[PDB]
UniProtKB/Swiss-Prot annotation, chains A, B:
Provenance organism: Homo sapiens (Human)
Entry-linked SUPFAM superfamilies: FAD-linked reductases, C-terminal domain, Nucleotide-binding domain
Catalytic activity: a D-alpha-amino acid + O2 + H2O = a 2-oxocarboxylate + H2O2 + NH4(+); D-alanine + O2 + H2O = pyruvate + H2O2 + NH4(+); D-cysteine + O2 + H2O = 2-oxo-3-sulfanylpropanoate + H2O2 + NH4(+); D-dopa + O2 + H2O = 3-(3,4-dihydroxyphenyl)pyruvate + H2O2 + NH4(+)
Zinc-finger among keywords: no
Uppermost EC category: oxidoreductase
Effect listed in the UniProt record for changing D31H: Increases affinity for the FAD cofactor and D-serine. Decreases the cellular ratio of D-serine to L-serine
GO MF assignments: D-amino-acid dehydrogenase activity; D-amino-acid oxidase activity; FAD binding; glycine oxidase activity; identical protein binding
Listed PANTHER family: D-AMINO ACID OXIDASE, D-AMINO-ACID OXIDASE
EC number(s) recorded for this UniProt protein: 1.4.3.3
GO cellular component: cell projection; cytoplasm; cytosol; extracellular space; peroxisomal matrix; presynaptic active zone
Name this protein carries in UniProt: D-amino-acid oxidase
Protein's gene: DAO
Self-association state and partner proteins as the record states: Homodimer. Interacts with DAOA; the interaction is direct, can occur in the presence or absence of FAD or substrate bound to DAO, and results in a complex containing two DAO homodimers and 2 DAOA monomers. Interacts with BSN (via coiled region); the interaction is direct and inhibits DAO enzyme activity.
Length: 340, 340
């Protein structure tokens, strides 16, 4: 009963934990190893603000809306716990700004107190003429990743610093089940032309008077490419850079400018806020998440592979529902093998 | 014209600013001095969290609701102003929690996006069965008082550290108009049987993940005597203590425990918060604010006095509408001295 999880971002970590809680037994022990090239604070998960917000429009797969709703409901149950702070979990309200009356999102009833913005509220954002206000949740990846690791290490899970070259390399060493949570890099283990980097740049600023998230939406700039302000526990994330096919890990100076000028125009009080840091990450962009089983067609034994990658700009938002689905796929592997 | 403003809390400073910006001219040159025994951070204004919220039910004087509304409208028009950070001015959303249903407040349309709490939002507060959600403003005194002081200084207003023994002592040194903004200590200059300290105690805690205010209402505890959580710029104010007639300036453990126990039950995450500081202050409690002119008959001349005190637990909420009214009374004085 040897299981190897490839990846230590929110995907692999929550998957490892979910499989362990649901399938570990002293009767039938479950050996679980996590192999990863990069760990916290150096994953894509660490670059995220951690705000819960799926895409505005209905997903290519309606199963994704269920996975996001299951994640919200799960995080909402731990929000008023003493453990909440160790997770990087907290409630936050905020604004979604538009230039037109776009349709209501499928998640209007999952979030708390969703409503349209009133005239006086919109008078605060002269560049926008429609929007929403609701209460959502922030799950900060750097705390959540450390918390998941702590809970994994105490459940018997060993962590290994390694760049996996092939699934067959892992299959050869005895892995019965391979959990593929490689994010944006998955194409290195198996070609997937639907998987692309969604290059992102963010600024971390000191603006503690900022109690609300502010997200803007422009068709001319596209998804995740217009100003956003997201207050964290210690700092405020400034963003709004999406570049499909861009693999540059360096901080582009025109992007730094776009972030600064766009966010200051959105919220003039940012102009006097102290810039703390700047980061680049690659969103694992895909028309839909890949969350399925694959029987390896290489080597003398067939190896069971659970793929869990391609969560684009909403991995923190959907991680739990995806972890639970991967655990379901895992139990299906267990039954098909044998009972007695 | 020689003006002496007694008091350097929010009332004294905003009145002095409002009078100077409206009346100092070539036609009416004003010599304004401010006398105060205590300056920031040692005034009642400094103990306050600075949240804008008047009384729920219609005031004894309907003028008070107009004065609070004028204050919110003025502060709201500056929320994105270059000076907002210097003022300590920012937007904040939050909860007003009740055991039973209560009528909508007279200010429901002054605040932003006022509405009732939904069942899912109410499930987060088991001890309460009814509530509101709205967006208001915080104006922090430690910043606001220093901002008003800098504004008065550039206008040529002179500040003196002194404990005024009597209005006559001021009148005898040449004051034409005395603006009495002495807060809870006004009785020492002229007996006021309707003025009492509304003793308050607060804790300032490090809980930066707290993004909303939470105010609880209990008619058995009375006004300002039920737990409240008010996130500021650097710290979160924990309070909920009102002791009518208590002149003790010391912080006490009983009140420390009431605050801590009450606010931790409301928000379990507070258990792990670091306590930064604790303060005691005296709300200037009266059945209504005394904002009126008086011709003082103590000495060879009559001195024109403007009283502006008795703002209770809502001095920050109402200060600007009161400062504008004091200025109108000041104009009536100049108009009588046959020089306007
Ligand atoms: C700028 C920006 C802002 C964002 N904001 C939000 C937000 O507010 N809310 C939200 O829900 N989402 C947000 N996201 C998306 C979120 O960051 C990602 O969807 C989530 O981090 C992807 O999770 P992951 O586990 O798949 O990838 P990662 O965190 O990238 O983990 C991939 C893991 O796979 C490992 N790995 C890959 N290949 C191999 C190999 N061959 N061998 C060994 N290890 C390997 C890596 O080392 C790493 O451990 C944001 C993204 C960006 C870029
Ligand atoms: C615990 C607590 C929390 C609160 N929270 C809020 C809130 O969130 N929002 C809100 O709107 N309000 C709040 N308040 C109300 C606000 O603090 C007071 O209404 C406002 O501070 C009253 O201001 P003031 O100018 O009249 O008095 P103060 O701020 O006390 O200043 C009185 C001034 O007069 C001076 N003075 C008095 N007598 C003399 C004399 N004889 N000679 C020389 N100088 C003299 C003092 O030295 C001082 O400079 C709160 C109050 C308390 C106690
Ligand atoms: O840039 C992103 O990928 C991103 C910004 C926000 S705000 C909520 C989710 C999310 N994702
Ligand atoms: O304790 C007080 O006097 C007080 C608490 C709050 S919250 C808004 C006003 C106000 N006043």
């Amino acid at each position: 009963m040897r299981v190897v999880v490839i990846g230590a971002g929110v995907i692999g970590l929550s998957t490892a934990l979910c499989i362990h809680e649901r399938y570990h037994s002293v009767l039938q022990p479950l050996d679980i190893k996590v192999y990863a090239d990069r760990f916290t604070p150096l994953t894509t998960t660490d670059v995220a603000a951690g705000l819960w917000q799926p895409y505005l429009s209905d997903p290519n797969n309606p199963q994704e809306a269920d996975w996001s709703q299951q994640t919200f409901d799960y995080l909402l149950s731990h929000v008023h716990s003493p453990n909440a702070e160790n997770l990087g979990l907290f409630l936050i309200s905020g604004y979604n700004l538009f230039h037109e009356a776009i349709p209501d999102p499928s998640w209007k009833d999952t979030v708390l107190g969703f409503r349209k913005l009133t005239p006086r509220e919109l008078d605060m954002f002269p560049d926008y003429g429609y929007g929403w206000f609701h209460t959502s949740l922030i799950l900060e990846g750097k705390n959540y990743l450390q918390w998941l690791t702590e809970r994994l290490t105490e459940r018997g899970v060993k962590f290994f610093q390694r760049k996996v070259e092939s699934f067959e390399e892992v299959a050869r060493e005895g892995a019965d089940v391979i959990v593929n949570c490689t994010g944006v890099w998955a194409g290195a283990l198996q070609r997937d032309p639907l998987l692309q980097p969604g290059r992102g740049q963010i600024m971390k600023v000191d603006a503690p008077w900022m109690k609300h998230f502010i997200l803007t939406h422009d068709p001319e700039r596209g998804i995740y490419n217009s100003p956003y302000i997201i207050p964290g526990t210690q700092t405020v994330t400034l963003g709004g850079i999406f570049q499909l096919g861009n693999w540059s890990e360096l901080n582009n100076i025109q992007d730094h400018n776009t972030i600064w000028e766009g966010c200051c125009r959105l919220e003039p009080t940012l102009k006097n806020a102290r810039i703390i840091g700047e980061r680049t990450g690659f969103r694992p962009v895909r028309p839909q998440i890949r969350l399925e089983r694959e029987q390896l067609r290489t080597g003398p034994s067939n190896t069971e592979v659970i793929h869990n990658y391609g969560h684009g700009g909403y991995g923190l938002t959907i991680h739990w529902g995806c972890a639970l689905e991967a655990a379901k796929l895992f139990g299906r592997i267990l039954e098909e093998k044998k009972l007695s």
